[PDB]
Amino acid sequence: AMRLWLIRHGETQANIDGLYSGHAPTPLTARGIEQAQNLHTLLHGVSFDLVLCSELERAQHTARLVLSDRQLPVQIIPELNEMFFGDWEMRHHRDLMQEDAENYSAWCNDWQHAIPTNGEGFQAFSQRVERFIARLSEFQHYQNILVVSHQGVLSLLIARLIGMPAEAMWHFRVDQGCWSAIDINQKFATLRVLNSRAIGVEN
Amino acid sequence: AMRLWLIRHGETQANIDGLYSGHAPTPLTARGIEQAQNLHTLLHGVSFDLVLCSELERAQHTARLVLSDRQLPVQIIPELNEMFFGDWEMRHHRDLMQEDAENYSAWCNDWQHAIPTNGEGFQAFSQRVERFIARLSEFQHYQNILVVSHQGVLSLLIARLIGMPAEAMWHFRVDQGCWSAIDINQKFATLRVLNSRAIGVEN
Numbered sequence: 001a002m003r004l005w006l007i008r009h010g011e012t013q014a015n016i017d018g019l020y021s022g023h024a025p026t027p028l029t030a031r032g033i034e035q036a037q038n039l040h041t042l043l044h045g046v047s048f049d050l051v052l053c054s055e056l057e058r059a060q061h062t063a064r065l066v067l068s069d070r071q072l073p074v075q076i077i078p079e080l081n082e083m084f085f086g087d088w089e090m091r092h093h094r095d096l097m098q099e100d101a102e103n104y105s106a107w108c109n110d111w112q113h114a115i116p117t118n119g120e121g122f123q124a125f126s127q128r129v130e131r132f133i134a135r136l137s138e139f140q141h142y143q144n145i146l147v148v149s150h151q152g153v154l155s156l157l158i159a160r161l162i163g164m165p166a167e168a169m170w171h172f173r174v175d176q177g178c179w180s181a182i183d184i185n186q187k188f189a190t191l192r193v194l195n196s197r198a199i200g201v202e203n
Numbered sequence: 204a205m206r207l208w209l210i211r212h213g214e215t216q217a218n219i220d221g222l223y224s225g226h227a228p229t230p231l232t233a234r235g236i237e238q239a240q241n242l243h244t245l246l247h248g249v250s251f252d253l254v255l256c257s258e259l260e261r262a263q264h265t266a267r268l269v270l271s272d273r274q275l276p277v278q279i280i281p282e283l284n285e286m287f288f289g290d291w292e293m294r295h296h297r298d299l300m301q302e303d304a305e306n307y308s309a310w311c312n313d314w315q316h317a318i319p320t321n322g323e324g325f326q327a328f329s330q331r332v333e334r335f336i337a338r339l340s341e342f343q344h345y346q347n348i349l350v351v352s353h354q355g356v357l358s359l360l361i362a363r364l365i366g367m368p369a370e371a372m373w374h375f376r377v378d379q380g381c382w383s384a385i386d387i388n389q390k391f392a393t394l395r396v397l398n399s400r401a402i403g404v405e406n
């Protein structure tokens with residue numbers, strides 16, 4: 001009886017500027033901060049047993065805002081980090097087609113196998129998220145787990161938990177300022193909530 | 204750019220008694236009516252141009268309550284009907300195990316191939332929902348479609364739209380009193396919301 005409460009970090013400056021966000025630092029905007037504050041209200045009644053957060057500061061900043069009233073052991077997991085884009089970090093799609101046309105166009109036509117320049121390909125990234133899924137049995141005695149991460153990770157986590165290939169991650173888009181939930185009972189994952197802005201209740 | 208707003212009908216007396224509820228009539232309770240009235244408040248700002256509904260009066264009753272203010276002709280689609288349970292309609296699992304032991308035991312163990320007594324099996328039920336997916340192109344010029352149906356249909360619809368086998372329908376459970384949304388862009392289906400109790404806004 002394990003419920004994973006999925007949370008994507010708030011809106012960042014890189015989102016407003018339409019840049020690639022990977023391991024590079026970018027701060028939460030004023031709206032992204034208030035999104036995490038509203039989530040603190042919407043999940044105030046949930047008694048989490050553990051917080052799982054990415055190494056990136058914008059994720060940890062969100063986790064702190066959702067748990068302002070409270071105090072709870074937070075665990076920092078590098079497998080929850082967004083895909084590493086290498087030389088493409090904090091750069092726009094229009095500029096990459098002119099400054100790195102050869103590699104970037106191959107990425108646009110076959111993102112599953114083309115590797116971003118000096119970055120992390122999709123195969124290695126999906127293996128890293130798969131490593132986190134195999135690691136969830138370590139938390140078998142926690143009932144409610146809060147997971148603060150990024151859209152590429154959370155969409156892939158949903159896809160693989162309920163048995164789809166990694167390439168099907170884009171059938172699920174998780175949004176900022178919302179929360180999602182997935183239940184795992186006897187290694188069977190059930191998507192219960194996806195992108196809710198309502199008050200969450202334990203069950 | 205098609206968005207299907209999915210709504211399962213509210214709580215019924217059959218739900219209160221824990222009975223198999225398929226094609227047999229069963230009324231909304233006072234709570235099930237209140238669920239549809241709250242959904243009317245949640246979706247007040249969504250400009251539906253079409254409402255798809257099953258033949259069951261309890262689903263049409265829900266659609267009328269969700270759209271009390273608006274005027275919008277309800278299209279009655281028998282493919283959106285719940286699975287037909289035949290002689291098992293409006294009966295309890297505790298009683299069916301004794302009175303129809305051989306057939307009901309087979310259904311509990313091989314539910315994807317065993318036929319409910321004088322009912323419709325899961326193969327014919329999945330083909331029927333598949334038939335509904337095939338004629339979705341008839342609604343290509345509508346943008347916000349309200350789909351009022353039942354849990355078996357809506358779970359199977361989501362699973363098949365994003366490319367999963369019919370038997371994976373139980374990785375998604377559509378709850379009562381909530382709304383879900385799936386977007387279809389160039390024959391690619393995206394699950395955007397699953398069982399929300401928050402205010403909905405159209406894309």
Ligand SMILES: [Cl-]
Nearest residue numbers: 025026057058
């Ligand atoms: Cl950051």
Ligand SMILES: [Cl-]
Nearest residue numbers: 215218224354
């Ligand atoms: Cl029902």
Ligand SMILES: [Cl-]
Nearest residue numbers: 228229260261
């Ligand atoms: Cl009815």
